[PDB]
């Protein structure tokens, strides 16, 4: 539940 919201509000990055 929290990971979904975490991924929507500009808190999670991506690293190639």
């Amino acid at each position, epitope marked *: 539940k929290k990971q*979904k919201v975490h*991924a*929507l*509000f*500009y*808190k*999670l*990055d*991506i690293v*190639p």
Partner: antibody
Amino acid sequence: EVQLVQSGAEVKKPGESLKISCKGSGYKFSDYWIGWVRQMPGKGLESMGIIYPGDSDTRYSPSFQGQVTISADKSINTAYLQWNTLKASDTAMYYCAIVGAKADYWGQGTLVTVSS
Amino acid sequence: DDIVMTQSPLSLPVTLGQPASISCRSSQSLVHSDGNTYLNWYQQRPGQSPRRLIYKVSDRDSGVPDRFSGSGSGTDFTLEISRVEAEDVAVYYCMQGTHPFTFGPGTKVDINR
């Protein structure tokens, strides 16, 4: 390595159904929201809706609710945008993008031309 | 009821080697209940996909040159380019950074004369 690759250009007639795709590679596709954006020839950008591929939680913009279906097959890291019956006014460029992350990645676009 | 996003000007003349500024307004405050303000800027060059420049009013995306900056609060937002370069000629869009992700109309940059 992180990329979104969309399906190719579409030449279709009014009345046909259409489902176009966006494949994301190089990252955990299930964990990041995917959005679709429409750009009519010459006009600005418009948000259509977003999907969380992990569980297919979908949220449409009020302007496109009921006009399209957004879905995803996460086993092949692919999101989709679908029309039951195309109109000539659906002629546009359609983009997919990662939404809501600190990183920004967009597909190359799918050009859809609908004409009889 | 629905938020409306505007930009000024709709066409901006620029000169290479000089600064430039674009404004964005929302009809109501964009401050979220969590205290953040979610307002993004995007650049779209002719024949290319959009790319984000700014999120959360002033955070610059990776790879975006430091000549780009975002500013503002509540309903008033600005994108500034401290020294315009050739590659900066493009259309720029502000966007409400939470659902329903309303885009501004776009500001078209061209060469001043």
